[PDB]
Amino acid sequence: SMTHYDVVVLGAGPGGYVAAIRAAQLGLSTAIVEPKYWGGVCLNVGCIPSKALLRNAELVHIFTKDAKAFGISGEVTFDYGIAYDRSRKVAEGRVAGVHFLMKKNKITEIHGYGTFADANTLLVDLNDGGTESVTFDNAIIATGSSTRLVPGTSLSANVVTYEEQILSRELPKSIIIAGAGAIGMEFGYVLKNYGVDVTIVEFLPRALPNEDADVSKEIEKQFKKLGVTILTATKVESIADGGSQVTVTVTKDGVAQELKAEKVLQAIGFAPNVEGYGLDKAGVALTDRKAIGVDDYMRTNVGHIYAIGDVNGLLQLAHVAEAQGVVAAETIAGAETLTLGDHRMLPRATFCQPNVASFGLTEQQARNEGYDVVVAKFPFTANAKAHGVGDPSGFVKLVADAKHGELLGGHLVGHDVAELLPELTLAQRWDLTASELARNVHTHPTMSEALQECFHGLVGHMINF
Amino acid sequence: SMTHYDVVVLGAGPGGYVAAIRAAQLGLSTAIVEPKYWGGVCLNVGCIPSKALLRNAELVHIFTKDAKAFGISGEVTFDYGIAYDRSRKVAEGRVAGVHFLMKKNKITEIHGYGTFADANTLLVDLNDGGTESVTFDNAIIATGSSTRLVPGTSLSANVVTYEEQILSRELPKSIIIAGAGAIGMEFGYVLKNYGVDVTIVEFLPRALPNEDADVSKEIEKQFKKLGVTILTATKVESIADGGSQVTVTVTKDGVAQELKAEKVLQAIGFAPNVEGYGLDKAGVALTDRKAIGVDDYMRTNVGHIYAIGDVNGLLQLAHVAEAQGVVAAETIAGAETLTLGDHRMLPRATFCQPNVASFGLTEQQARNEGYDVVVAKFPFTANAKAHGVGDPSGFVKLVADAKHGELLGGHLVGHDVAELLPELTLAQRWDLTASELARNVHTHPTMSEALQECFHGLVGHMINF
Ligand SMILES: Cc1cc2nc3c(=O)[nH]c(=O)nc-3n(C[C@H](O)[C@H](O)[C@H](O)COP(=O)(O)OP(=O)(O)OC[C@H]3O[C@@H](n4cnc5c(N)ncnc54)[C@H](O)[C@@H]3O)c2cc1C
Ligand SMILES: Cc1cc2nc3c(=O)[nH]c(=O)nc-3n(C[C@H](O)[C@H](O)[C@H](O)COP(=O)(O)OP(=O)(O)OC[C@H]3O[C@@H](n4cnc5c(N)ncnc54)[C@H](O)[C@@H]3O)c2cc1C
Ligand SMILES: COc1ccc(NC(=O)CN(C)S(=O)(=O)c2cc(Br)cnc2N)cc1
Ligand SMILES: COc1ccc(NC(=O)CN(C)S(=O)(=O)c2cc(Br)cnc2N)cc1
């Protein structure tokens, strides 16, 4: 078969399927090509099921640590197999949801793997073995990324990516997680709570090393108290799968040590999917770090080909991929659009308990860049609902420029603080300062009141602390 | 014993103690008079302990009724006695915090009950037995409110207000609650989850009658499945306490009906405390509904006397009282401030599960007032986080004026949606439109994403529904 579309989308993750919806809304005939995962990594083996598992693990944590406090009597047991099953039900529901949205928007689904032949044509190897050719006026590449392996190591039966681990109904006795980013922590949290022995190795001197140092310290303390072992400033040298166990050679301070465990999880980063589908034929240029290069409108060096989501390596998160997809489709149609701006300002979160949530500049980053830095910090031990909820740990930390009280960054750790970010990002985007923000009344009692107190701290004096 | 202060606050609830802090920060020498409740109703027997109890009740529901879904096994029971005990610790902890804040801000605590003798003099019956006269330049009345009883009814052994009820360690077999406001629904939710059979009697034809109609219906549906009986359009006309049971005569037109239970809770509302402390001798005028009259700066008819919090009847919530206290103290100091404005725009929430949270106008209010009304509604069944957490019910409903996309109201029901209001009220308070709100990128996966979907809905079309 041969057909022509205004827009063809490569990949059906949050980037692609949203970009496709948006193009269809703006009146463009749209097709979307995907061989495996509708809803991409996020809906099938990423954000969606993992958040279901973390919820289960939180309930375990609540019991095994706070049963006495909440007046719980009983020997209560938690089957991981049921946590697993529920994670699959939840993923399956949303994937079906994607299909509903494609149909609602009259978007043509093409089930196969797509490869550029020219800058205007796409060769698709269909899953049933056949072929079809799609010619397009515009293409939106949303092919995502794949796991980056520790150099010189490989995958095997007991050395896995997020993908094999998140799909395991059965659980290992012990695991070593390479990398202490968002995904490494979240997996560490779920597995430990469910009885697995967990060791996490990070090369940089901090867990969650992109976060504010005050946040890294807080989350490390919580994990050590949970019983997870975190090795920082430590380099994975080699990984040996001996069947009955995995042997991980590790160096710190010029001292090699061996760590053993049943399994090893590789979670040190994600490399953009860029090879094997004809970017060269299309004339699309890569960056130094082998991501697809793009301007502020997600346009590649080829005027009519766009690149959105993890494949551009700018900030590998689903909400980013969604927003870039919307940018790309509006630019194609000629519709009114706004670029995302500096991606450092975009919000980010980790969903273990305590939650981690942030946007913009850390305290130290702000000082290093020449700002007149003001900082306000409010511990959740001074918040009424945090005590009411049983988790007074953590804090809200804002950093601003003193001249006008403009927000440069927000850094939160505590119970479900991921939900508290939008007031901040809204303020940052539309130039609302601490002084305007301090005049927004917050409902009592919520965790959100800690935001109000920080706003006050920036302009002068906190009340409740 | 004589003494003098620039400002004397009467009452130490949220309104009083925050007013005193803000006054201290502004250089004014400050005293605060309170005989029983430091932190007032809110911290001692109101918001704070009740939120702890609701947390406990939430966990009861999950560990019993949702046990199988979460793979929870074993025989498990919850002791309400421990839920009570924890609520008391949480309360005393916050009450302690109030004393520290007084001490930090150099506020003089007067322990006793104050009565006005004139417009500039206050007589205090001290708890230690003595007395002392206090003279002042500015007074801030923050004397709170008291439960209003169903007309022609009486408190007794088995007919209580929130105060006796929340301080009970043991539970009754049955209870009838008069009033389907926030306090009634919250006691309804706690007690039902702990196995009490609960009946709620509301005179108006809806539960939570001040919310949007869609919200009232949804929460009624939720309470029904919980096993709470709600009787709407129903007038309580007599309560007879037989010692071993209580007889409630009820009228759902045009017929009388008898309801029986071990206890009855009166929760139909609150009347400002304006009697027995010399308001007449200071020349402080009362409104029609017997609240203390005030202007937009909380000034009474006596220029140097202010009334904040529940005593002015404007909106009986803790965050409102705090906010008014700041306005009062700031106006007194000759400091910059901003009046709260139309109190309908202030946020409010009910903290059962699912939460109810709202601000501004209901849809039908906006239509009646001649707005060109746009309404966008997003259900949480289409939200990833909601499924992952195990509570996909409820929705987010926004209403706006079609001219510029200005928000008029927001109305949320669902898991912990109280935390989602800040973005919305900041937008309304600074005239940010739906178009600008739609560009604020929300972290995935969060309940907060439901907001972003609604913003897009107000602008044109939603993506994920
Ligand atoms: C365990 C885990 C947890 C995560 N949790 C979160 C979280 O909580 N919050 C968050 O924001 N992010 C989270 N992420 C990240 C998130 O998964 C990604 O940001 C997101 O999936 C990116 O969307 P995408 O469309 O850009 O790429 P993808 O989601 O990977 O979708 C890309 C798709 O393109 C397809 N494709 C590739 N090549 C071709 C081709 N030649 N032809 C056709 N199709 C092709 C692939 O099959 C794939 O389905 C998590 C990731 C993992 C691994
Ligand atoms: C069960 C329950 C749950 C609630 N939950 C919430 C909630 O979740 N969120 C929310 O926002 N609100 C909630 N409220 C309402 C909230 O408690 C009140 O709005 C708030 O306490 C008002 O603060 P206030 O300072 O204005 O008055 P108060 O809190 O009542 O404090 C007033 C104080 O003044 C003192 N006083 C009175 N007369 C004198 C005098 N002559 N001399 C000296 N002192 C005097 C009293 O002793 C009292 O301590 C709840 C109320 C109840 C009953
Ligand atoms: C009426 O039928 C339906 C079926 C499905 C939907 N919508 C969805 O399922 C919705 N997404 C698929 S989603 O998984 O929740 C999601 C994914 C991402 Br990435 C961002 N936001 C959402 N809401 C709406 C309506
Ligand atoms: C150093 O010791 C402390 C500990 C805690 C505090 N602050 C508090 O306890 C704080 N309030 C008493 S509170 O109950 O939480 C509260 C009540 C109201 Br009304 C609004 N906001 C808050 N935070 C101060 C000092």
Residue B451 dihedral angles phi and psi, to the nearest 5°: -60, -50
**Which two tokens mark A401?**
């420029």
B92 touches chain A (CB under 8 A): no
| Residue type present at position A322 | E
3-state secondary structure of B331: helix
Contact A384, A449 (CB under 8 A): yes
Contact B314, B343 (CB under 8 A): yes
**Which two tokens mark A169?**
């109904």
**Judging by DSSP bridges, how do beta strands B235-241 and B229-231 pair with one another?**
unpaired
Question: What H or E segment, with its residue span, contains residue B218?
Answer: helix B213-226
Contact A393, A414 (CB under 8 A): yes
Instruction: Compute the radius of gyration of chain A from its Cα atoms.
Output: 23
B19 to each of B9, B87, B107, B307, how far by Cα in Å? 8, 26, 11, 11
Domain ranges for chain B: 1-147+269-343, 148-268, 344-465
Instruction: Choose, out of A441, A452, A453, the residue to mutate when testing the contact with B (most B CBs < 10 Å).
Output: A441
Provide the chain A residues 138-167 that lie in CB contact (below 8 A) with chain B: none
- Eight-class DSSP state of B281: H
Helical ranges in B105-212 per DSSP H: 162-166, 182-193
Contact A26, A330 (CB under 8 A): yes
How many residues does the structure list for chain A?
465
Which residues of B participate in the annotated binding site for FAD?
Answer: 34-42, 51, 114, 310, 318
B427 touches chain A (CB under 8 A): yes
Gap from CA of B41 to ligand 2 centroid (Å)? 4
| Residue B241 to residue B426: CA distance in whole angstroms | 49
Q: Which one, of A70, A134, A426, lies nearest residue B451 by Cα?
A: A426
Q: What is the CATH number of domain A344-465?
A: 3.30.390.30
Residue B401 dihedral angles phi and psi, to the nearest 5°: -90, 135
Residue A82 dihedral angles phi and psi, to the nearest 5°: -75, -35
Q: Which one, of B357, B54, B96, B385, lies nearest residue A390 by Cα?
A: B54
Helices vs. strands in chain B: H and E counts, helices first? 14, 24
| Residue A75 to residue A59: CA distance in whole angstroms | 14
Helical ranges in B308-383 per DSSP H: 318-332, 363-368
Q: Tell me how the structure was determined.
A: X-ray
Residue in B8, B18, B32, B47 to alter for ligand 2 test, most ligand atoms within 8 A of Cβ: B47
| Residue B140 to residue A177: CA distance in whole angstroms | 59
Residue A241 dihedral angles phi and psi, to the nearest 5°: -95, 105
What are the residues whose beta carbons fall under 8 Å from the beta carbon of B89, sequence distance 6 or more?
none
Instruction: Choose, out of A443, A448, A451, the residue to mutate when testing the contact with B (most B CBs < 10 Å).
Output: A443
**Which two tokens mark B11?**
């009452």
Q: Is the CB of B101 under 6 A from ligand 4?
A: yes
Q: Do the domains spanning A1-147+269-343 and A148-268 agree at the CATH topology level? A: yes
Provide the chain A residues 311-370 that lie in CB contact (below 8 A) with chain B: 317-320, 322-323, 326, 338, 340, 346-349, 357
Residue A51 assigned ligand-binding role: yes
Provide the chain A residues 193-232 that lie in CB contact (below 8 A) with chain B: none
The reply to whether residue B71 touches residue A79, judged by beta carbons under 8 angstroms, is yes
| Residue type present at position A432 | L
The reply to whether residue A387 touches residue B436, judged by beta carbons under 8 angstroms, is no
Q: What is the dihedral of CA B111, B113, B117, B119, to 10 degrees?
A: 70
Catalytic status, residue B111? no
3-state secondary structure of B275: coil
| Residue B13 to residue B17: CA distance in whole angstroms | 6
**Which two tokens mark A157?**
């039966």
B311 to each of A345, B11, B370, B377, how far by Cα in Å? 43, 10, 33, 36
| Residue type present at position A47 | C
Question: What H or E segment, with its residue span, contains residue A418?
Answer: none
Q: Which residue has the tokens 């009724």?
A: B65
Q: Top-level CATH class of A148-268?
A: alpha beta
Q: What angle do CA A202, A205, A208 make, to 5 degrees?
A: 65
The reply to whether residue A441 touches residue B346, judged by beta carbons under 8 angstroms, is yes
| Residue type present at position A186 | E
Half-sphere exposure of residue B318: CA atoms within 13 angstroms, side-chain side: 23
| Residue A112 to residue A128: CA distance in whole angstroms | 8
Distance from CA of B88 to the nearest CA of A (A): 11
| Residue B115 to residue B123: CA distance in whole angstroms | 5
Q: Whose CA is nearest to atom 45 of ligand 1?
A: A11
What are the residues whose beta carbons fall under 8 Å from the beta carbon of B92, sequence distance 6 or more?
none
3-state secondary structure of B406: strand
| Residue type present at position B105 | N
| Residue B147 to residue B179: CA distance in whole angstroms | 12
A425 touches chain B (CB under 8 A): yes
Choose the catalytic residue: B99, B444, B456, B461. B444
Q: Which one, of B215, B217, B176, B171, lies nearest residue B193 by Cα?
A: B171
**Cβ burial B283-316 (10 Å sphere, 16+ → b, else e):** ebebeeeebbebeeebbbebeebbbbbbbbbbbb
Contacts of B441 in chain A (CB under 8 A): 319-320, 323, 340, 346-347, 425
Resolution in A: 2.4
Half-sphere exposure of residue B380: CA atoms within 13 angstroms, side-chain side: 25
Helical ranges in B105-170 per DSSP H: 162-166
First to last CA, chain A: 69
**Which two tokens mark B294?**
């005030």
Helical ranges in B1-119 per DSSP H: 14-25, 40-45, 47-65, 80-104
Gap from CA of B37 to ligand 4 centroid (Å)? 15
Q: What is the CATH number of domain A1-147+269-343?
A: 3.50.50.60
A64 touches chain B (CB under 8 A): no
| Residue A168 to residue A360: CA distance in whole angstroms | 36
| Residue B42 to residue A446: CA distance in whole angstroms | 14
